[model samples]
Target: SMEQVAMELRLTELTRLLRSVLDQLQDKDPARIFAQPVSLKEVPDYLDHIKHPMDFATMRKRLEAQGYKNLHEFEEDFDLIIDNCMKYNARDTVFYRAAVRLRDQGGVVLRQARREVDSIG
Candidate 1:
């Protein structure tokens, strides 16, 4: 079962990477470093564990108290969270996890970061 879960997580990771690339492309013009489109070769040969529904109702319920009107607003905060994760990580685990969370939460855009911001007791 470990292998199966790992495979699924791999796909989820790839999907997250693809989405992050697109997000970067938007808002700001894709600079030379990120100008290239993600190729089919870049996609993993596994299945994503998290699946988003075709409609927004499910997501609406998830964000009931958050007062979000649509996925776009959700994405804004999501991307910010991801950005902060990237900034915080010595490695890239936080960035990847935030991406997976956004995908699971209906393709939301994150903001700066949403990590464990603890420095001391």
Candidate 2:
């Protein structure tokens, strides 16, 4: 019975952090840069080249569904979204540069979340 609190609290802390992280990106990418899924018809080769396709919309769904087993998976999925864009687009393009910025901003926010969450019950 006591273990139940631990399980739920762990989930609570991690899920809260991820949800916070997702919100920042959703706010940051106003152009729907990583908000929507990639369209295969428009970028046909994308499906072939990408190892793990991830997007902010899907990440939001997964977090709300409590789908990822660990916080690491959530972060990895976040990275994949940014990485996929950088890989698919030319270095000079908007998306690639945005991805670069997200990595920095995301890193800062996640760390910010950690300290705040650590102080919580």
Candidate 3:
């Protein structure tokens, strides 16, 4: 019960932080390709290259459902999106470059979240 209480408290903060990060990510992607899941029909070989696919919509859905146990899980899923992009696209391609940008810039978003949390706690 004590741990559950601790987890609940953590979730409240983590969820807020995650929501902020998600909003930042949406702003980062002007093309809006990462807004939703990639359709298999649109990219038939997507699964062939990416074993696990992740998107902003899926992250939002998971956040709404309280599916994450902690912030690290959320970050891993976010990284999966970037990782999948790196795997599926050439280094010179827009998709790959976008992922690289997100990969680095996303940390800035998280750090901002951390500072916000620190300010409160």
Best by TM-score: 2
| RMSD to true structure for each model, in Å | 16.7, 2.1, 2.4
> Which is the leading candidate under lDDT?
3
Clashing pairs in 2: none
Q: What C-alpha lDDT, on a 0 to 100 scale, does residue 113 get in candidate 1?
A: 18
Candidates arranged by lDDT, highest first: 3, 2, 1
- Model 2 / residue 5 / CA error / Å: 5.3
In candidate 1, stretches whose alpha carbon ends up further than 4 angstroms from where it belongs are: 1-62, 92-121
Off by over 4 Å in 2: 117-121
TM-score of 3: 0.83
> What total of clashing residue pairs does each candidate reach?
18, 0, 0
Candidate 3, residues 1-121, lDDT tens digits: the string is: 9999887888777788778778987788888768889899999888887888999999999998778766678778988888888888899998999988887888888777667766765
Positional deviation of residue 35's Cα in model 1 after best superposition, in angstroms: 32
lDDT of 3: 0.83
- TM-scores of the models, in the order given: 0.27, 0.83, 0.83
